[PDB]
Design an enzyme around this catalytic site. Structure first.
Site, PDB file in Angstrom:
ATOM      1  N   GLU A  85     -14.230  -5.953   6.610  1.00 33.07           N
ATOM      2  CA  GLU A  85     -13.749  -4.561   6.555  1.00 33.07           C
ATOM      3  C   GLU A  85     -12.900  -4.100   7.769  1.00 33.07           C
ATOM      4  OE1 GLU A  85     -13.743  -2.626   4.214  1.00 33.07           O
ATOM      5  OE2 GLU A  85     -15.363  -3.179   2.812  1.00 33.07           O
ATOM      6  N   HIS A 137     -10.494  -5.496   4.179  1.00 29.60           N
ATOM      7  CA  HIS A 137     -10.539  -4.202   3.517  1.00 29.60           C
ATOM      8  C   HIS A 137      -9.380  -4.105   2.503  1.00 29.60           C
ATOM      9  CE1 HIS A 137     -11.453   0.079   3.363  1.00 29.60           C
ATOM     10  NE2 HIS A 137     -10.166   0.335   3.504  1.00 29.60           N
ATOM     11  N   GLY A 140      -6.815   5.592   0.824  1.00 28.10           N
ATOM     12  CA  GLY A 140      -5.712   5.958   1.662  1.00 28.10           C
ATOM     13  C   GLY A 140      -6.113   6.924   2.761  1.00 28.10           C
ATOM     14  N   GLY A 141      -7.411   6.995   3.056  1.00 24.40           N
ATOM     15  CA  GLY A 141      -7.838   7.845   4.182  1.00 24.40           C
ATOM     16  C   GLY A 141      -7.768   9.304   3.861  1.00 24.40           C
ATOM     17  N   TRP A 171       0.798  -1.269   0.000  1.00 25.68           N
ATOM     18  CA  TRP A 171       0.000   0.000   0.000  1.00 25.68           C
ATOM     19  C   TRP A 171       0.815   1.297   0.000  1.00 25.68           C
ATOM     20  CZ3 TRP A 171      -4.390  -1.344  -1.722  1.00 25.68           C
ATOM     21  CH2 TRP A 171      -4.959  -2.582  -1.373  1.00 25.68           C
ATOM     22  N   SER A 211     -12.628   2.819  -0.598  1.00 24.09           N
ATOM     23  CA  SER A 211     -12.498   3.557   0.685  1.00 24.09           C
ATOM     24  C   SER A 211     -12.509   5.092   0.479  1.00 24.09           C
ATOM     25  CB  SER A 211     -11.250   3.082   1.419  1.00 24.09           C
ATOM     26  OG  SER A 211     -10.962   3.347   2.796  1.00 24.09           O
TER      27      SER A 211
END
Ligand SMILES: *[C@@H]1O[C@H](CO[C@H]2O[C@@H](C)[C@@H](O)[C@@H](O)[C@@H]2O)[C@@H](O[C@@H]2O[C@H](CO)[C@@H](O)[C@H](O)[C@H]2NC(C)=O)[C@H](O)[C@H]1NC(C)=O
Ligand SMILES: *[C@@H]1O[C@H](CO[C@H]2O[C@@H](C)[C@@H](O)[C@@H](O)[C@@H]2O)[C@@H](O[C@@H]2O[C@H](CO)[C@@H](O)[C@H](O)[C@H]2NC(C)=O)[C@H](O)[C@H]1NC(C)=O
Ligand SMILES: *[C@@H]1O[C@H](CO)[C@@H](O[C@@H]2O[C@H](CO)[C@@H](O)[C@H](O)[C@H]2NC(C)=O)[C@H](O)[C@H]1NC(C)=O
Ligand SMILES: *[C@@H]1O[C@H](CO)[C@@H](O[C@@H]2O[C@H](CO)[C@@H](O)[C@H](O)[C@H]2NC(C)=O)[C@H](O)[C@H]1NC(C)=O
Ligand SMILES: *[C@@H]1O[C@H](CO)[C@@H](O)[C@H](O)[C@H]1NC(C)=O
Ligand SMILES: *[C@@H]1O[C@H](CO)[C@@H](O)[C@H](O)[C@H]1NC(C)=O
Ligand SMILES: *[C@@H]1O[C@H](CO)[C@@H](O)[C@H](O)[C@H]1NC(C)=O
Ligand SMILES: *[C@@H]1O[C@H](CO)[C@@H](O)[C@H](O)[C@H]1NC(C)=O
Ligand SMILES: *[C@@H]1O[C@H](CO)[C@@H](O)[C@H](O)[C@H]1NC(C)=O
Ligand SMILES: *[C@@H]1O[C@H](CO)[C@@H](O)[C@H](O)[C@H]1NC(C)=O
Ligand SMILES: *[C@@H]1O[C@H](CO)[C@@H](O)[C@H](O)[C@H]1NC(C)=O
Ligand SMILES: *[C@@H]1O[C@H](CO)[C@@H](O)[C@H](O)[C@H]1NC(C)=O
Ligand SMILES: [Cl-]
Ligand SMILES: [Cl-]
Ligand SMILES: [Cl-]
Ligand SMILES: [Cl-]
Ligand SMILES: [Cl-]
Ligand SMILES: [Cl-]
Lengths: 524, 524
Positions: A322, A433, A113-114, A79, A195
C-alpha cells in the site's frame, strides 16, 4: 436499444466482449449540473426530458488537479482523467448483460483519488467484463471532488460540506428508482470502491440517508477511520478561509465568502486548493468528508464504536505494498527510476514528509517500532513504505473490520499480494496501492492484453468471489476446489490471501504493527 | 525450657505477650560461620555440640553498609541493624506458642533490604504477637547480603553466586529437620518476606532444591521479575572485577582473585561495593541473585513463562505508594522535610537518576505516559513516585501473579492502602514501601503503643488472613462478616484492598500503567 427512465429515454450502444454482447449506457445525467449558484451546493434533482438522451460516450470528469509528476509515464498517467474536465460532470454509466437480464444483482463502483481526484471513465474501471462474465449490472458515477465537492462551512447550505458524498448518494437513488427498467434488482445492490472510494463506501454504511439505497459493501484499500479520510471541523474552517484569503474572497458574512467563491473560474479554485495547508503530504486530502450534521451526524469513530451503522455483510481488503506509491511523491532518496536504497537519515527526513505536524517523540517512536532490524541495504526503504501503508491503509482497514464484525455481521478480509506482470513502476514498489483494481474488473480476462495465464485465472476467481459476495453475501468460489474464505471474527481474525500460486488462510495480519498505530500512536 | 535439636540442646526464654506466654529461641546457629576460607562459599553444615546452646538474644547481623542519609531519624534508622555486624551471622530465631503446640503451622520470614542490607532482629519483624495470637510458629533467619552473599564468578565454587539464597535454603532445611521438636509441622511451612525478601520467596518457588522445604508462599512488595531483583551474568562479571580492581585484587587466575578477596577486611569489601557500577540508583542492587546453574538453572523469566515452578497457592500484594521512599535518596527537589513540589525539569532530571543508562527516547516515553495531566502543583511529584513504584514493584508483582496463576493454582492479590498514624515520613510520601510489615506482624495489637483503634482492628484482620492462608491456603477472615477475598485469575484480575474503612473487591490494578512497563518498556 432505448430504455425508458423516470426522467426520459436513454440510448445505449452494443459492445462485443468475449464472443458475447454487453450493452453500455455511458454518461447518463443524474442531477442538475452544479453550475453558477449551484456551485458548492448539494446536488439538485433533474428535470424530465423529451427526445432520446444519447448515452454513447463517457461524460465530463469533474474539475480537478492532475498528477504532472511523471509526464509520459503510464504508471501515473493511467490515473489521470480521460475525459474533458467540467463543472458539468454529474453523470453515471450502466453496463448491462445482453441478453437483457430479468432481475440482475447491481454492482455500484465508487472511485478513489483522495477525494481530490478521480473519474469513473478510467480504463481500469470499465464494467463490461463484469457484466459479460458474471451477468451483473455495473453502475459508476462521477461525483465532485476537491473544494468543489467538499468545501465546508458547517450548517450553511451555501457550502455545507460532503457535497460529493451527496452526489454519490443521489446516484444510489437513481439506481433505486431506475435500475429495474434496465433489468436490475434494486433490492440487490452492492457498493464497491477503492481508497477514497472505499472510505466513501464505509460512510454510506454510516449515513442513515444511504441505509435503504444499497444491500452490501466492498471496501478495497480504504475505510472512514484511515487518518486521511475525514476532515476535522477545525481544519475545514481554516481551509475554507485560507482558500478565501488566496482568491481575494475574504469577507465576514460567511455567505458573502461563498458568493465570492462562486465567481472565481473553477481553475482559480483548483490552483489555490494545494496551498490551504502550510505543510501537505503526498497523502493530503485538503478538502474531504466532514461531520456536517446532515450526511454524517457525529464523529464516524463514535458511530463505529457504538454500532450505529447499517447491519449487513462487508468484504474488506488491502494490498501488500500500500505505502510504496506515495514515496516517490516527496520522500528524499526515492525514485521510480532507481532502487531507492536510502539511509537512516533519509528515513528520518521521510517521516518529516509524511508526519509534518507530529512531535519529535512521535516520530522517534515510529522509527523505534519500524527499525528493530531482523543489516540489509533495503531495510530503510522497506520500512518507510510499511510505515506509510500500515498507518494509512492496512491498520485502519483491519480496525474497521474488527469493529464492524463485533456487531454480529459476517465480514471477509483479503490480503492482495499479486504484482501485475504489466506494472510500469519498479520492482521495489511491489504490490502497489490501486493495482488490485484491474483484477476485480476482469482486465486479465482479455487475452489480447499480455497478462500471464496465471493472472487470467486469478482475476476469474476474484471476479467470481466478488460477484458471489454481491449476489449471495458470501465471497466463495464453489466449483473449482478453491479455498473457502472464512468469516473474519475479532477473536481469530482469519483472512484470505489472493495470489497466483496458492490462496492461504492466515490470521492476525500485521498484528504488532497495528497494535502500535491503533493503540499507541493516537496518543502522540 | 530446653529443646533437643539434631545438633544439640537449645534454651529459650519466656515472654509475656497479651496476658499469655510466648517462648522465644533467639539466635540458634544453622551453619558453620562462613569465615576465612568459607568467605564467599555456600553455607557448610554445622558440627554437633554438647552443653546447652543459649538462644536468649538475637545474634550478629551480617556485614552490610548502613543507611546514614538521615542520622537521628526513626523513619530510616528503624531499618538499620540493631545487633553487632559480623561475618559470623548465620543464625535464626523461633517463636513458639505457650503452651507448646502439637503440630503448629510454621511461618518463615525472609527480610528485604535490596539483597544488600537487612536483619531478622528488627522490631518490625518480631514474631511473638503472631505466635501468641494465631498459635503459629514464626521462624526468621539471617542470610548474607551484598558481595559477601552474592558475589559471582559463575561455575567457580569459590564464589558461585547466590550464597545468601543458599543461606535461606539451609535454614528451610533446619526447619524441615528440627521444627517437630518445637511442636511445629514441617508439612505446613509458609514462607513470607517483603521486597528483596519477597523476591527471595519467589526464587524458592523456582528452585528445585527448595521444592520440598516449604508448602505455600506470601510475597509482600517484591517478586523475582522486578527490574532490581536478578543480576545479569554480564553485570555480575563486571562487578566482581570492578570490586577486584578496587581492592588491589585484580588477577587472571579467577581463583586467585577470590583468594585475594578472602584477605580483605570485611569492611574494605563493604566500602568498595558501592562503586562497582559507574552510575547507581537509590534502587541499586550491586550484588544480587544470579543464574548460577545451581540455585537458579535458567533465566527465571523463562521458568515463570513456561510453568517450571512449585505448584502451590500464593498471596501477593503491594502498597499504594511503593515508589515515594526512594525519591529522597537522590531525586532533585525532593525532601522529607518539605512538600517536594517539583518542576517538569526536576521530574526529567529524576528520571535520569532512576533510569541512568536508558536512551533519551526511553525516558521521554515514561514522561509521555505519566504526564497526561487529568495543573495541580503536586502533579510532577506524584508522577515520579508512581513511575518508581509501578516500574519497580507494582507492575512486576501483578505480572508475576498473572503468570503464576495461569498454571492452575489459586492466587490472592492485595493492595495495601493504609498509612500508619505513627509514620515518621511526611504525608506526601503516603502509604510507603515497608509500612505494611508492622500490620502483618501485629504491632498495632499492642495497645500501649499509640496506634489507633481502627489500626488494631486492621492488623487483627490481616494477621487472621495471613494465618488462614498459611494454615489453610485461603486468606479469609470467616467470623466477622468480612469481605471474601476472591482468587486472582488472569481474565478478571480481582484483588482485595486493605484499609481501616472498607475492604473492596476491585479489578485490574494499574492496568494502563502496567501495559506500558510490561509490554512496551522492555523494548527501549
Ligand atoms: C490556518 O491557516 C493559517 C494560514 O496560513 C496559510 O495562509 C494560507 C493562505 C496559505 O498560503 C498557507 O500556506 C499559509 O501557511 C496558518 O497560519 C500560518 O502558518 C504558517 C506556518 O505555521 C505561516 O506561513 C504563517 O506565518 C501562519 N500565519 C498565521 C496567520 O497564523 C495555520 O497554520 C493554519 N492552522 C491550522 C489549522 O493548521
Ligand atoms: C564495567 O566496569 C567498568 C569499570 O569502570 C569502573 O571502574 C570501577 C573500579 C569503579 O570505580 C567505577 O565507578 C568505574 O566506572 C566500566 O567502564 C568505565 O565506565 C565509566 C563510565 O562509562 C568510566 O569512568 C570509565 O572511563 C570506564 N572505563 C573502562 C575501563 O571501560 C563499565 O561501565 C562497566 N560495564 C558495564 C557492565 O556497565
Ligand atoms: C535515486 O534517485 C534519486 C533522485 O535522482 C537520488 O536522490 C538524489 O541523490 C543525491 C543525494 O542522495 C542528491 O543529488 C539529491 O539531493 C537527491 N535527490 C532527491 C530528491 O533525493 C538517489 O541518490 C538515487 N539513489 C540511488 C541510485 O540509489
Ligand atoms: C525542599 O528541599 C530541597 C532540599 O533542601 C530543596 O531543593 C533545593 O532547592 C534549590 C533548588 O530548587 C537549591 O538550593 C538546591 O539545588 C536544591 N537541592 C536539592 C538536592 O534539590 C527544595 O527547593 C525544597 N522545596 C520546597 C520547599 O518546595
Ligand atoms: C443520437 O444518436 C443517434 C445515432 O444513431 C442519432 O440518430 C441521433 O440523431 C443522435 N442525437 C444527437 C446527435 O444528439
Ligand atoms: C427481484 O427479486 C426481488 C428479491 O430479491 C423481488 O422482490 C422482486 O419482485 C424481483 N423482481 C422481478 C423478477 O422483476
Ligand atoms: C449575511 O448575508 C446574507 C445575504 O446573502 C443574509 O441572508 C444574512 O442575514 C446575513 N447575515 C448576517 C445577519 O450577518
Ligand atoms: C473453473 O474451471 C473451469 C474449467 O477448468 C472453468 O470453466 C472456469 O473458468 C473456472 N471457474 C472459476 C470461476 O474460477
Ligand atoms: C546459659 O544461660 C543460663 C542462664 O540461666 C546459665 O545458667 C548458663 O550458665 C549459661 N551459659 C553461658 C553463660 O554461656
Ligand atoms: C502433623 O500433621 C501432618 C499433616 O499435615 C501429619 O502427617 C503429621 O503426622 C502430624 N504430626 C503430629 C501431630 O505429630
Ligand atoms: C588456578 O589456580 C588454582 C589454584 O588455586 C588451580 O587449582 C587452577 O588449576 C589454576 N587454573 C589455571 C589452569 O589457570
Ligand atoms: C472479630 O470480632 C470479635 C468480637 O467483636 C473479636 O473477638 C475478634 O478480635 C475479631 N476477629 C478477627 C480475627 O478480626
Ligand atoms: Cl507481507
Ligand atoms: Cl516537539
Ligand atoms: Cl485456491
Ligand atoms: Cl491508588
Ligand atoms: Cl540516546
Ligand atoms: Cl471488611
Amino acid at each position: 436499444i432505448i430504455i425508458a427512465t423516470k426522467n426520459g429515454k436513454v440510448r445505449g450502444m452494443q459492445l462485443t466482449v468475449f464472443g458475447g454482447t454487453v450493452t453500455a449506457f455511458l454518461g447518463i445525467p443524474y442531477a442538475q449540473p452544479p453550475l453558477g449558484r449551484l456551485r458548492f451546493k448539494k446536488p439538485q434533482s433533474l428535470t424530465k426530458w423529451s427526445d432520446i438522451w444519447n448515452a454513447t460516450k463517457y461524460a465530463n470528469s469533474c474539475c480537478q488537479n492532475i498528477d504532472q509528476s511523471f509526464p509520459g509515464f503510464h504508471g501515473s498517467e493511467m490515473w489521470n482523467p480521460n475525459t474533458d474536465l467540467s463543472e458539468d460532470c454529474l453523470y453515471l454509466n450502466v453496463w448491462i448483460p445482453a441478453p437483457k437480464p430479468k432481475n440482475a444483482t447491481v454492482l455500484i463502483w465508487i472511485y478513489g483519488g483522495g477525494f481530490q481526484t478521480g473519474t469513473s471513465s478510467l480504463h481500469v474501471y470499465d464494467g463490461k467484463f463484469l457484466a459479460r462474465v458474471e451477468r451483473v449490472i455495473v453502475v459508476s458515477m462521477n461525483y465532485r471532488v476537491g473544494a468543489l465537492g467538499f468545501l465546508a462551512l458547517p450548517g450553511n447550505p451555501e457550502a455545507p460540506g460532503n457535497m460529493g458524498l451527496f452526489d454519490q448518494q443521489l446516484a444510489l437513488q437513481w439506481v433505486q428508482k431506475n435500475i429495474a427498467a434496465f433489468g436490475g434488482n434494486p433490492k440487490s445492490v452492492t457498493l464497491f470502491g477503492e481508497s477514497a472510494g472505499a472510505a466513501s463506501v464505509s460512510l454510506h454504511l454510516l449515513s442513515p440517508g444511504s441505509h435503504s439505497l444499497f444491500t452490501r459493501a466492498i471496501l478495497q484499500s480504504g475505510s472512514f477511520n484511515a487518518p486521511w479520510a475525514v476532515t476535522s471541523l477545525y481544519e475545514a474552517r481554516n481551509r475554507t478561509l485560507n482558500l478565501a484569503k488566496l482568491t481575494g474572497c475574504s469577507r465576514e458574512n460567511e455567505t458573502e465568502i461563498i458568493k465570492c467563491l462562486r465567481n472565481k473560474d473553477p481553475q482559480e479554485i483548483l490552483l489555490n486548493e494545494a496551498f490551504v495547508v502550510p505543510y501537505g503530504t503526498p497523502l493530503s486530502v485538503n478538502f474531504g468528508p466532514t461531520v456536517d450534521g446532515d450526511f454524517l451526524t457525529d464523529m464516524p469513530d463514535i458511530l463505529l464504536e457504538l454500532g450505529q451503522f447499517k447491519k449487513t455483510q462487508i468484504l474488506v481488503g488491502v494490498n501488500k505494498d500500500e505505502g510504496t506509491a506515495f514515496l516517490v511523491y516527496g520522500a528524499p532518496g526515492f525514485s521510480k527510476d532507481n532502487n531507492s536504497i536510502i539511509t537512516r537519515k533519509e528515513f528520518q527526513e521521510g517521516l518529516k514528509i509524511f508526519f509534518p505536524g507530529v512531535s519529535e517523540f512521535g516520530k522517534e517512536s515510529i522509527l523505534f517500532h519500524y527499525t528493530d532490524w531482523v543489516q540489509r541495504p533495503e531495510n530503510y526503504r522497506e520500512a518507510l513504505g510499511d510505515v506509510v501503508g500500515d498507518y494509512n491503509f492496512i491498520c485502519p482497514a483491519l480496525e474497521f473490520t474488527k469493529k464492524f464484525s463485533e456487531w454480529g455481521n459476517n465480514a471477509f478480509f483479503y490480503y492482495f499480494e499479486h504484482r501485475s506482470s504489466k506494472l510500469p513502476w519498479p520492482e521495489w514498489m511491489g504490490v502497489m496501492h490501486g493495482y488490485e483494481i484491474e483484477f476485480v474488473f476482469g482486465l486479465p480476462l482479455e487475452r489480447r492484453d499480455q497478462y500471464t495465464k496465471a493472472e487470467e485465472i486469478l482475476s476469474r476467481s476474484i471476479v467470481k468471489r466478488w460477484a458471489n459476495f454481491a449476489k449471495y453475501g458470501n465471497p466463495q468460489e464453489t466449483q473449482n476446489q478453491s479455498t473457502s474464505w472464512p468469516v473474519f471474527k475479532s477473536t481469530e481474525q482469519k483472512y484470505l490471501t489472493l495470489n497466483t500460486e496458492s490462496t492461504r488462510i492466515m490470521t492476525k495480519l500485521r498484528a504488532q504493527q497495528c497494535r502500535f498505530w491503533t493503540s499507541f500512536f493516537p496518543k502522540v
